[PDB]
Ligand binder design. Structure first.
Ligand SMILES: OC[C@H]1O[C@@H]2O[C@H]3[C@H](O)[C@@H](O)[C@@H](O[C@H]4[C@H](O)[C@@H](O)[C@@H](O[C@H]5[C@H](O)[C@@H](O)[C@@H](O[C@H]6[C@H](O)[C@@H](O)[C@@H](O[C@H]7[C@H](O)[C@@H](O)[C@@H](O[C@H]8[C@H](O)[C@@H](O)[C@@H](O[C@H]([C@H]2O)[C@@H]1O)O[C@@H]8CO)O[C@@H]7CO)O[C@@H]6CO)O[C@@H]5CO)O[C@@H]4CO)O[C@@H]3CO
Ligand SMILES: OC[C@H]1O[C@H](O[C@H]2[C@H](O)[C@@H](O)[C@@H](O[C@H]3[C@H](O)[C@@H](O)[C@@H](O[C@H]4[C@H](O)[C@@H](O)[C@@H](O)O[C@@H]4CO)O[C@@H]3CO)O[C@@H]2CO)[C@H](O)[C@@H](O)[C@@H]1O
Ligand code: NA
Length: 446
């Protein structure tokens, strides 16, 4: 008994905001229906790209109108971007026919498409961007320059540490001449004192953005999408893992219940360890050897990791599915967490290794991996007398920075470099090799 409707794209199908003259646009039209003559049309929902609504009106001829400014707003939200790029909008109208008794009968109709291009954004300032706010002092001399990210050239960053929350604005370099700031040239938020921490940048009578946080923060500015975030930039200085295999952390402080990870050198909130996991072991991590601000399964885990180790979520615990030795890599800055499981590749480096310093992190310099939960990684026998160096190298760390995660043996213990400088040299002789028990924390050269 089912009714159909046919919609078509309205006459304003290709909107260029720079050029747009009207304050309302026609975006769609009901062209025909199999509903009887005399029926009224009611609109149960009008959505854009599936989950966005917008105020709308419908004319006597069943043309659907919206305010251009709100269509433009909704388009920029949908795409999280003010970029001046042609954006597709898919319009879904769910309508009903209404009889003289008031009964609504559902129309099954199609979707239609239009596009809209947001207005031209400011030019990128060749000399970059500055932050000025309560925390700096509102003047040219106090303005702090944002760092242009090496990987993404649209992205500018400032890390700061502040005593209380702060209002601030972003200025292009050309707005600032000596101590003088041209206030008319601010970039900021739509609302003065916006405390969302994550919103659009405005270039038109911009208000001040509020940090919403204090302490260590990071202010990010995307000068292509024109968006900003302000994020908690503090990080744990230590990190510990407990587990089903460790009595779930009882008692507190016990090196028996809590395993320290090793800080990555000079690298905020990032840690690593080499650990044995059985199948179905569950673990969680904490910033001390005890429960509190602990975490387990999180969202930023590689598909790689998940495949390599068979990882899954088990009531918020992290569950390891495939037994084995793994290099565990963990990063925590403010709220953002990353956990990676990787091959436990330990490498001989330097003078006692293959072609010396000249081939680094190569297959020959790889330590054999034990099958047991208490065996020993063993290096390739030394090719020469020289100083022994040993490392891992996580994906996230460049090969040049192998020394950020290096260690050695002193007095039959594994001594991690961690955040410290070069370790005291330890000599080996030709045909010797290293033995590591990561379960014990002990080792030998022999
Ligand atoms: O919650 C704490 C305070 O909140 C409010 O203070 C904020 C703002 O909300 C925030 O935007 C930002 O302010 C920045 C501006 O963003 C930045 O652009 C720059 O401001 C310059 C203006 O842009 C220029 O237009 C020019 O301003 C003129 C202004 O147009 C004139 O009207 C005149 O401003 C007078 C006011 O008229 C007076 O009423 C008086 O305002 C006092 C209030 O009386 C106080 O209650 C208090 O209010 C604060 C909120 O405004 C809260 O404490 O302080 C204001 C003054 O800040 O005095 C002002 C100034 O004498 O003269 C202005 C020129 O002097 O030039 C200004 C640059 O001076 O800098 C602003 C910061 O200084 O940050 C704040 C503070 O966190
Ligand atoms: O035999 C006892 C139980 O064994 C298993 O429970 C484990 C959990 O699976 C582990 O996750 C862990 O629980 C921690 C928890 O992870 C940690 O957050 C903290 O819990 C806080 C919680 O964050 C807070 O919101 C509030 O509710 O207080 C909680 C503390 O009570 O501490 C937990 C440990 O106390 O360890 C337990 C074992 O103790 C198994 O899943 C259970 O069904 C079983 O009963
Ligand atoms: Na080598």
């Amino acid at each position: 008994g089912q009714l159909t409707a046919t919609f078509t794209a309205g006459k304003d199908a290709s909107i260029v905001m720079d050029a747009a003259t009207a304050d309302s646009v026609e975006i769609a039209k009901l062209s025909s229906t199999t509903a009887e003559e005399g029926s009224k049309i009611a609109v149960n929902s009008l959505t854009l790209n599936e989950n966005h609504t917008i105020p709308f009106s419908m004319t006597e001829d069943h043309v659907f109108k919206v305010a251009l400014a709100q269509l433009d707003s909704v388009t920029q939200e949908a795409y999280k971007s003010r970029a001046s790029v042609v954006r597709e909008l898919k319009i879904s109208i769910n309508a009903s026919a209404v009889t003289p008794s008031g009964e609504g009968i559902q129309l099954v109709g199609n979707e239609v498409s239009i596009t809209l291009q947001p207005a031209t954004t400011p030019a990128v300032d060749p000399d970059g961007y500055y932050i000025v706010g309560d925390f700096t002092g509102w003047d040219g001399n106090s303005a702090q320059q944002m760092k242009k990210d090496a990987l993404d050239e649209n992205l500018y960053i400032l890390e700061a540490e502040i005593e209380s929350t702060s209002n601030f604005k972003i200025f292009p370099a050309s707005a600032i001449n000596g101590n003088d700031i041209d206030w008319t040239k601010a970039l900021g938020s739509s609302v003065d004192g916006d405390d969302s921490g994550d919103n659009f940048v405005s270039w038109t009578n911009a208000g001040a953005i509020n940090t919403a946080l204090d302490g260590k923060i990071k202010i990010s500015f995307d000068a292509f999408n024109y968006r900003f975030t302000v994020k908690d930039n503090s990080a744990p200085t230590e990190l510990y893992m407990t587990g089903s295999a460790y009595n779930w952390g009882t008692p507190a402080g016990d090196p028996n219940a809590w395993k320290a990870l090793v800080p990555v050198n000079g690298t905020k909130g990032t840690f690593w360890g080499i650990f044995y996991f059985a199948a179905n072991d569950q673990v969680k991590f904490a910033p001390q050897a005890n429960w509190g601000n602990d975490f387990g399964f999180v969202d930023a885990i590689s598909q790689e990791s998940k495949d390599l180790a068979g990882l899954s979520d088990e009531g918020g615990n992290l569950k390891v599915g495939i037994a084995g030795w793994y290099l565990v890599y963990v990063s925590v800055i403010g709220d953002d967490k990353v956990i990676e499981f990787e091959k436990p590749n330990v490498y001989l480096m330097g003078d006692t290794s293959y072609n010396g310093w000249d081939a680094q992190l190569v297959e020959q310099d790889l330590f054999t991996v034990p099958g047991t939960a208490d065996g020993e990684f063993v290096s390739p026998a030394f090719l020469k007398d020289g100083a022994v160096r040993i490392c891992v190298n996580p994906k996230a760390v460049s090969a040049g920075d192998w020394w950020k995660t290096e260690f050695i043996i002193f007095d039959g213990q594994i001594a991690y470099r961690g955040n410290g400088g070069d370790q005291a040299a330890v000599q080996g002789k030709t045909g010797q090799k290293v033995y590591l028990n990561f379960g014990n924390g002990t080792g030998r050269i022999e």
